[PDB]
Design a protein around this ligand. Sequence first.
Ligand code: HEM
Ligand code: HEM
Ligand code: NA
Ligand code: NA
Lengths: 713, 713
Amino acid sequence: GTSNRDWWPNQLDLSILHRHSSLSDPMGKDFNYAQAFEKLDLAAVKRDLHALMTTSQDWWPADFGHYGGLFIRMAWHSAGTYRTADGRGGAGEGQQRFAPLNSWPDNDNLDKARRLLWPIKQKYGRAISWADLLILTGNVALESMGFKTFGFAGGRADTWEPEDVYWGSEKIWLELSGGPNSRYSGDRQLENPLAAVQMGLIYVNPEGPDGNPDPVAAARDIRDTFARMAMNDEETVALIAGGHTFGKTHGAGPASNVGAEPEAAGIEAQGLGWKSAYRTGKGADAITSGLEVTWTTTPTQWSHNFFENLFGYEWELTKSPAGAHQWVAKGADAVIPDAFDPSKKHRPTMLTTDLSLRFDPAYEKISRRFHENPEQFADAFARAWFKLTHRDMGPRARYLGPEVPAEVLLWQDPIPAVDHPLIDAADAAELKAKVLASGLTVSQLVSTAWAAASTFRGSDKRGGANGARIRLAPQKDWEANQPEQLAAVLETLEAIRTAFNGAQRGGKQVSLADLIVLAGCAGVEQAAKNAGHAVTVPFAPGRADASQEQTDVESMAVLEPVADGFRNYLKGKYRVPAEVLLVDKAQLLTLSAPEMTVLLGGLRVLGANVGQSRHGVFTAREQALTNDFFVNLLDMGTEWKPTAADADVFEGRDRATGELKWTGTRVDLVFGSHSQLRALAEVYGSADAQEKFVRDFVAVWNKVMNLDRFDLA
Amino acid sequence: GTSNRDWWPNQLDLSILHRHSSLSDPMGKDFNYAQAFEKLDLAAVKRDLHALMTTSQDWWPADFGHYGGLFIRMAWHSAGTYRTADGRGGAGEGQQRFAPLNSWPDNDNLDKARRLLWPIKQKYGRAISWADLLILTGNVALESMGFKTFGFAGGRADTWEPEDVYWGSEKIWLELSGGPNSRYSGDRQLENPLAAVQMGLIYVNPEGPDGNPDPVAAARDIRDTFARMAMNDEETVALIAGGHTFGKTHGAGPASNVGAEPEAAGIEAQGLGWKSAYRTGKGADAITSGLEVTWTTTPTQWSHNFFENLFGYEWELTKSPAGAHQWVAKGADAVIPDAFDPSKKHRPTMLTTDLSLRFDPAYEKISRRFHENPEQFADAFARAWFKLTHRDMGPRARYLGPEVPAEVLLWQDPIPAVDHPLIDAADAAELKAKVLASGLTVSQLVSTAWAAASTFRGSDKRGGANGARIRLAPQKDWEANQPEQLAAVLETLEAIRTAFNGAQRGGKQVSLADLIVLAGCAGVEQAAKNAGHAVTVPFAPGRADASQEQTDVESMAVLEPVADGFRNYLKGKYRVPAEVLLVDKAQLLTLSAPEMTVLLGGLRVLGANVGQSRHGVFTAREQALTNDFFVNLLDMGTEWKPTAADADVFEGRDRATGELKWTGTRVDLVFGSHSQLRALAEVYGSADAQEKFVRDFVAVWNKVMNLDRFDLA
Ligand code: HEM
Ligand code: HEM
Ligand code: NA
Ligand code: NA
């Protein structure tokens, strides 16, 4: 069946905004996972998980009689898809059970791991999501094997179809760099937003960069990809060495024995894949990565043996039985146990990427510190395992259950507790009137509140107006935020705040985070009033102000909007057309197409554009909340052409006289071009739609203001 | 961006069940189009449309100063995509404004037509849908030019994204037959469900079959495609000659002048396409099809001059200025007016397909009758135009407005009026108890009610339980319906009905259509009872019984289920895997993936399979409504393998002992294979799911029972 994608492969794809509908979700529209989880007997689940560890099934026998290593790898891959660039991937939606990740090469045989967990999933049902279960099982594996974890939070709700993620452009699994769709250019620069070296890998190639077994050059890829997963050098060394304290790799024979990945397998395989024709196909004969390495003398118990081995031998390059590059300890005795045969032992072995930890000079210093101080190693790994597995969960308000660590961590972008009474309706009316009396304009108030709130992304639930981090480094300096205008708005708001707070009795006070949002609401009200409409914009207080010391400036950089079609802003020239970037931003904001349409049309006439650009400002009454953008956009009296100077700017001229009426960008005109967007614009550009437009705009505005409000919702 | 479709291009696609979500719809959840339409001033809309016919815009000047012919074509293409095989296509969802239809080659310059209607669409807003407007404008065009129409119904709600339709497998627009993706095989057999001869055409090639200008062979393609659009010989001749009473074709110069279709055009084109570099690019210079034919001496007025010309001259094969084949009247005077230059006249011209109406001997008889009796011709055409533009609207209860024709037409599958009091809740309880006391089993009651209700298809809104047409030819004899078992059930239910109706006072009575549905409800209640669960299944009376004389048997044939995965039924061997056909049936029933999953699992254990096949009957308590299908399917203790005899049947054996536990088809096992369906099955197979399963099954059962109940809309 030929589809629209086949005929017009570069048209914009709006279906990413309408994923995750009530249609595809088997749970009722009222189902609340948090509530179901809070009633789970978590201790019972963990008892069943402990039992499972050593209950070997014949269809995938447990190495060393213990599945712990398999399950640690499973949890680590669940978490490992995360990219800091967009917040996409990670463990938080349980996506490992869906395409493509269920069938990525690096997820080979983790289908077996997941199937071993079905009986537990079945027994506890909706009260523990797969997403939570994959992480908790990893925790229990570590505990079962003697490692004390730093804690665990539940609350990852399951999802029901695959997430739309750009994982790269290659059309071949595992394609090496420099192909026609290379993710690399120049001096090994990985394209944003990617965070892995080859299509279908989690981070790096375990043989070395594009297969070349150089531990020093492998280290470079490790550092880069782990940084792109929000992990620094100490955390990276702790995780790799921590992980590889356990279990083993699987490469007992050639890879040509292994058949189709799960999404390609026959219907009879019942959701499993990588069926192997080598000997028994499993256990002692297992083939997963192709490498055959077992790191420690006690693969089912926490130990300090990884760094003893790493530093205590010299390493020789060799090949696994499948032909992969790996390393064996020069002159060592056979001290490593076999996974199935008590009469066999093996010499110590390492991956290229393990040797990175010794041969990269910066890693070597950390690795030695961990070798010499194993308690520091254990604490770093526990903290890093928690960060790994929680980094995409968002504010601590979302963390459920009785094992949540009390310690607040910088990477959680923490927001202080509110400890005082909040403002009430009367106070909010007072503050709005003071904001409007100050002289701040509709444009300034709307722009500032937009800038504060629209950093939120639903991918990892970072960002938003809570915290008032717009006043801090680095947000206060972002170009999209118009630093000098921003500074003037914040100054006036801060004086309003000070005065209001100084007049109160009791502990009552308003946060700047709340006042930024409320001032934006007053701007929207005033805009509606300018259009001759009475409107009330909802507002929920309770935001708090974070400090600069609670705001990691390097981690904040990934939230900078380099493209924001809602403010007609593009920081540079990008490979992707601007309308694609708009739909991407709408997705991170959790907006549907109709919400994206309404919001952008409104923002245009309110004066939210960066730099007060006239592009898309299709009204003669700026700062009035009207549907003018749609009515003027859709007017067939006007003809549009790209300009001389710039193909991405368009001039709209009267079709009869030739006179210039407007100018717009691609983000503006896509609403007049794309056949689904134009159908939306038509509704809001119709003669009966002014009230609809206002009321839809206010709703989506309030939606955006509340995106990070996990303390309420 | 590599997608799951790219990696696994043959995996089943569930996203067709989740279109049309509340997310993509700009109207509120409570918007009711019929309520908006009933307050439209339809007379005022028609006055605007009438004025528009002769108000020429310079960006697309009106031929002869009158847009009528353009709008008639626009409405005929809106309607002309309809296929009787699946009910997909037609005018009823306004799909011409979306991809792909908006950019089909046969819809060339209809973008102009639709744009001319924006100012009226804008004026009346949500009270008239684009879908309705397209058709109304065609009617008003005919009226304006002196043709009396048969009527008009409103009620086609707008849609907001493209419909998923199989339009063929060709990868090149207009590809001639016999390519690698040929829609033809054998002796010019067009593949079901297609209804056109080439990709991107409405019906046939106006030059002749694959461009060969032979009228006799063209007639064969006309007859075949029109039949596949539910039009017979009389209706086809009336429509083609009726249409071609008006307007003209456009081929003033070569087609290489014409640019990209709308979905490929630049953003500045603002949703228009086929921009032409030939001279002015429009009006007198217009290029649309490439043909340059004007059929009558008064292209803007109804006449009987198409047949006067057709029979009054001999025709010579010629070429248009673009090079297309077309026909000119041998030795005729220049009597046909020019579209822009009052001092020029042209000889009569015809398409190959026009001459079909004279040179195919069956067509010729009808055409002569219409020539000699033009009042017969006007009546046939009015009736056929109404059928053409309404054939996918569904039951007459959906028809809105003051111009709906009072005559009931056989092609409507008419349902008699109900003229007596309906049964009440106490009566329904009494009849359920009588049904259960008769000895009819859960399996019989469920099977029969399923058979009657599951003929519905949301594509053209035909079928469903209303009418009790399951008791009539041809439904009573369809294999899927198990004719001998059916007849026994219907006999017993008819005795129950007779006894209940005979005992009443006061005119109250129950129809057989209602009793068949109610009995099915009693079966599902009894199944729930057998499982230890008291539930009440909703039931809405008001169905009526249609007669054999009100049932067109030949038109009913397309509703026969030759594949019904809900009854594990496949009438023959198909190129398409059975799972794909299941998802296709789910789409026609308007089911989401969770609804399809719950319903199939339930039906299995209720005994709804055709022929009492054991395939998928994964329970040891058949006729009890339990989640056993999912629990047993998902049990890893069972291993599945295709059978020797049949690759499409699978044996489930105990993994340890080898003992045979079950058998199933592809339709069964897909729920344990496909990654998204298995996630659904897991919900209903969990230990906490019995109440959910029951409730969701009752909901979807009731939904299916009510699919055609537009009288309660
Ligand atoms: C540079 C980063 C890493 C590389 C290249 C990498 C590579 C691999 C490979 C190839 C395997 C063998 C798969 C098989 O054949 O069965 C594996 C196993 C595993 N890795 Fe990693 N790894 C990395 C980091 C991690 C991290 C961060 C963790 C956890 C904190 C982790 C924990 C595991 C464990 C427990 C296993 C053993 C699986 C079993 O016993 O079945 N590794 N690693
Ligand atoms: C065998 C069936 C049919 C064929 C092959 C056919 C073919 C065509 C073609 C090739 C054009 C010229 C497009 C252009 O160059 O502008 C056209 C025009 C037209 N057709 Fe048909 N047609 C068929 C049936 C119908 C029917 C069923 C109707 C309506 C009842 C219809 C109404 C018209 C009208 C009104 C125009 C004139 C458009 C104008 O004035 O701009 N045709 N036809
Ligand atoms: Na994420
Ligand atoms: Na249809």
